[PDB]
Amino acid sequence: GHVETVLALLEKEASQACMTKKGFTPLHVAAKYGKVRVAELLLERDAHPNAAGKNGLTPLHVAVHHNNLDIVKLLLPRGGSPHSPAWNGYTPLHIAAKQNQVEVARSLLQYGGSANAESVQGVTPLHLAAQEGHAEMVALLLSKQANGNLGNKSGLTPLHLVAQEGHVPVADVLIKHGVMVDATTRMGYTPLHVASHYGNIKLVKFLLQHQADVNAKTKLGYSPLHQAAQQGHTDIVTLLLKNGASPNEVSSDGTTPLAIAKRLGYISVTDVLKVVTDETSFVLHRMSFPETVDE
């Protein structure tokens, strides 16, 4: 970060195509190390921000990983990359949400943002924002206009992920906005099913208030009970049962919530579930897990 040295290098016309084996650009180290006085020097030679290496990364993507936003706010008029994805198809929106800077939403709001762009998985920036579910996100995301609950390849809707992490705040914000409470996955799992597998009574109570069905069955017969029993989360199973969840529902494999609780040797659960459950629909080991976005 010696700026007058770079001024000396400028008259010698060093190329700005200086590319390493890792795919870095001269803009990337200025984005990382926060040595930024040379940025106006780099634009004296009319630098172009659109530059993607082997990993397809942009100055904004490297900038948001370690944010010195004063450069980015001025790069946006200097032909900034509005919807640039990474090699993973990742937009700056959801990675900025996961990094969760306080003004990065305002930084993109200076230009705008798309929180519905498809990744290589099919996940939207709205869904990855809801997965972290920060405090300012549920306020700011309102200004952006996007599908409130957006499925992925799995069919995972923001509500589903919120139930997975059991973030009550986000689950509230989302229900208030009018997202689908019982949104289903490609296999047929709802945010209740998923919360019951998680075993979070809070992430289940909230959903009960949201009116997600307590007997929502999967395409293979698994219900939020079967799931709480396989998980061994007696708390969630009791919350379901108390709220009317049926305990005598046979799945596509012939195992009820009791059958499962038993096979898994969970006794605390088996005591309530086995008695609440009626006699097993059939005389007799495939489990049931909700979908999740891949790495």
Binding site: R78, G79, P82, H83, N116, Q145, N147
Partner: protein, 284 residues
């Protein structure tokens, strides 16, 4: 230099209420329109409507011109155009934010339409939320009559030295009047936001509210038919002020022929015009 004209307008897709610019037709040789299914039809002659030419003359008489702009990216052109709009009191200063947010959205292309599942007209609002416009949503007559290897084919049809011309039109509710912007860059620059096969040289922006005797699509079509002419684009290259453009538009409109509604057989009626048009084109 030869020209290649592309027309885009504001729409919104159905899966998510998100506005975006969509192309509607091209003017390589003849007007070739884009149907709802996403397939291009047959080339054909360019006919306009009288309201389009009237409103084009009215809005170009009080329009805003920007000659020899020194830019390389669309954001700078947008900012300078908005500042020049504010200077002549075309729009109110409190609307600058909304128009700058509008003019910087992503510009899709013909390949993504089947991924989008269809798009519908979307007029802007002060809060930025999309809604359906309060106007009859009857489709265009050209879409009703001309639709119901192509990249390499047009690439062979593309002249090797040509400078493209982009026209962007639409409707926005929160403004109070239609406004015009005619911008000519100093040298041809490759805008990264919009993918056009040849660089951009000119830029037309016509935007405003919902008004009587105004259809924005036909007005844009009239602008494209202007830009496809030889002498008018020669005067645009030789232009240095708004007076030369107005004089060239007067000269262009002086050499048109209007057809009233006649009950004659249509082929005989259309074939009677030919030597009249030949004499007019000799006179022009």
């Amino acid at each position: 230099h030869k020209v290649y004209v592309e027309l885009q307008e504001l729409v919104m897709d159905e899966k998510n209420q998100e506005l975006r610019w969509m192309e509607a037709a091209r003017w390589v040789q003849l007007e070739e329109n884009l149907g709802e299914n996403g397939a291009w039809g047959r080339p054909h002659l360019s006919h306009l409507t009288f309201w389009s030419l009237l409103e084009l003359r009215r809005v170009f008489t009080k329009g805003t011109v920007l000659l020899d702009l020194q830019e390389t990216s669309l954001a700078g052109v947008a900012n300078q155009l908005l500042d020049r709009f504010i200077f002549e009191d075309q729009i109110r200063p409190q609307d600058r934010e909304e128009l700058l947010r509008a003019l910087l959205l992503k510009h899709s292309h013909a390949g993504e339409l089947e991924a989008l599942g269809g798009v519908k007209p979307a007029v802007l609002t002060r809060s930025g939320d999309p809604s359906q416009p309060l106007l009859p949503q009857h489709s265009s007559l050209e879409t009703q009559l001309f639709c119901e290897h192509s990249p390499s084919g047009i690439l062979e049809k593309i002249p090797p030295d040509s400078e493209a011309t982009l026209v962007l039109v639409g409707r926005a509710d929160f403004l109070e009047q239609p406004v015009l912007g005619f911008v000519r860059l100093q040298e041809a620059a490759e805008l990264e936001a919009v993918e056009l096969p040849v660089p951009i040289r000119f830029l037309f922006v016509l935007l405003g509210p919902e008004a009587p005797h105004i259809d924005y699509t036909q007005l844009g079509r009239a602008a494209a038919t202007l830009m496809s002419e030889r002498v008018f684009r020669i005067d645009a290259y030789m232009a240095q002020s708004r007076g030369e453009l107005l004089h060239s538009l007067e000269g262009f409109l002086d050499c048109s022929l209007v057809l009233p509604p006649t009950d004659a057989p249509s082929e005989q009626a259309l074939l009677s015009l030919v030597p009249v048009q030949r004499e007019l084109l000799r006179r022009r």
